[PDB]
């Protein structure tokens, strides 16, 4: 097996790991790096080529150019530098200060967040979306973890990160993707219809009601119920629950929760709604 990327003398001369961890799964993990050269801070990606006995090198390519293709799209992290060892491929990607707009979605932040802040946040993960969309592009894992934050005293901008789930229109429903947390599932991918843009505007309406109501809109007892309640829509729109959101924001994201995928308008569409329409 021969390297295609940059040599890892070559990380090891210019960057300097620091024992900041950012992120660490099953087959990836995300250290923060220093430039020498600059002294800029950096995410690191180390990426596992081998992953269950299977040659994944082509995946982590496929990955690559979707990073690459948004590379003018600011709503989309900035891939810098790519390198490459023995059994890893490392991602020199820009570094999110802020860190996940999952930590908004809990009761701890609730109320230093306002709903002025999560029109501007919304309205940024549209502009992100439109663009991968209008590219034949979808995330198919817009849950709030791949989901930063530029910085966040003040709040900051959004970035959108992982790229693994990322296939083209039309493909259809492989097992990689009915794989991850149960609570953030489409209705269409639990009965295996060919997935489409529409599963992304999905997420983004469980996106907005996390941080409305810092509250899970799907999430049961056990994984079991959870399924029932995403291929049922089980929504939790109560008056106790929704006495301090807007109506306009109501309308929002039950447009957006829908059965249908068909019925879910399109990212154009959401970017016109009237709750997203406030003169800041
Ligand atoms: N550039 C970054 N800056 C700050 N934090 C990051 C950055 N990239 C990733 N993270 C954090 O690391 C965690 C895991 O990274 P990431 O989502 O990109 O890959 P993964 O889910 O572990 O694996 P895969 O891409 O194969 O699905 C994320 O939840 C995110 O919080
Ligand atoms: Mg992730």
Same mark, same amino acid.
């Given at each position: 097996?021969?390297?295609?990327?940059?040599?890892?003398?070559?990380?090891?001369?210019?960057?300097?790991?620091?024992?900041?961890?950012?992120?660490?799964?099953?087959?990836?993990?995300?250290?923060?790096?220093?430039?020498?050269?600059?002294?800029?801070?950096?995410?690191?990606?180390?990426?596992?080529?081998?992953?269950?006995?299977?040659?994944?090198?082509?995946?982590?390519?496929?990955?690559?150019?979707?990073?690459?293709? #948004?590379?003018?799209?600011?709503?989309?992290?900035? %891939?810098? /530098?790519?390198? &490459?060892?023995? $059994? *890893?491929?490392?991602? +020199?990607?820009?570094?999110? #200060?802020?860190?996940?707009?999952?930590?908004?979605? %809990?009761? /701890?932040?609730? &109320?230093?967040? $306002? *709903?002025?802040?999560? +029109?501007?946040?919304?309205?940024?993960?549209?502009?992100?979306?439109?663009?991968?969309?209008?590219?034949?592009?979808?995330?198919?894992?817009?849950?709030?973890?791949?989901?930063?934050?530029?910085?966040?005293?003040?709040?900051?901008?959004?970035?959108?990160?992982?790229?693994?789930?990322?296939?083209?229109?039309?493909?259809?429903?492989?097992?990689?993707?009915?794989?991850?947390?149960?609570?953030?599932?489409?209705?269409?991918?639990?009965?295996?219809?060919?997935?489409?843009?529409?599963?992304?505007?999905?997420?983004?309406?469980?996106?907005?009601?996390?941080?409305?109501?810092?509250?899970?809109?799907?999430?049961?007892?056990?994984?079991?119920?959870?399924?029932?309640?995403?291929?049922?829509?089980?929504?939790?729109?109560?008056?106790?629950?929704?006495?301090?959101?807007?109506?306009?924001?109501?309308?929002?994201?039950?447009?957006?929760?829908?059965?249908?995928?068909?019925?879910?308008?399109?990212?154009?569409?959401?970017?016109?709604?009237?709750?997203?329409?406030?003169?800041?």
């Amino acid at each position: 097996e021969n390297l295609y990327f940059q040599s890892m003398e070559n990380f090891n001369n210019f960057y300097i790991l620091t024992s900041k961890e950012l992120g660490r799964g099953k087959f990836a993990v995300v250290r923060q790096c220093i430039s020498k050269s600059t002294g800029q801070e950096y995410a690191a990606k180390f990426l596992k080529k081998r992953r269950r006995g299977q040659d994944c090198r082509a995946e982590i390519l496929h990955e690559i150019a979707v990073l690459e293709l #948004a590379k003018s799209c600011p709503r989309v992290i900035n %891939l810098h /530098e790519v390198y &490459e060892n023995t $059994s *890893e491929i490392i991602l +020199i990607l820009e570094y999110a #200060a802020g860190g996940e707009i999952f930590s908004l979605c %809990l009761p /701890e932040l609730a &109320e230093m967040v $306002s *709903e002025n802040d999560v +029109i501007r946040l919304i309205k940024q993960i549209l502009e992100g979306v439109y663009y991968l969309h209008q590219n034949n592009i979808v995330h198919l894992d817009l849950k709030p973890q791949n989901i930063l934050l530029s910085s966040i005293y003040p709040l900051g901008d959004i970035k959108i990160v992982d790229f693994g789930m990322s296939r083209k229109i039309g493909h259809a429903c492989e097992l990689r993707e009915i794989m991850g947390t149960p609570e953030y599932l489409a209705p269409e991918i639990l009965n295996y219809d060919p997935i489409t843009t529409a599963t992304d505007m999905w997420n983004i309406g469980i996106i907005a009601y996390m941080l409305l109501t810092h509250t899970s809109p799907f999430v049961g007892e056990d994984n079991q119920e959870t399924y029932l309640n995403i291929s049922q829509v089980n929504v939790d729109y109560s008056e106790e629950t929704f006495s301090s959101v807007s109506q306009l924001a109501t309308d929002f994201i039950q447009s957006l929760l829908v059965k249908n995928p068909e019925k879910r308008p399109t990212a154009e569409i959401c970017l016109s709604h009237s709750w997203l329409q406030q003169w800041d």
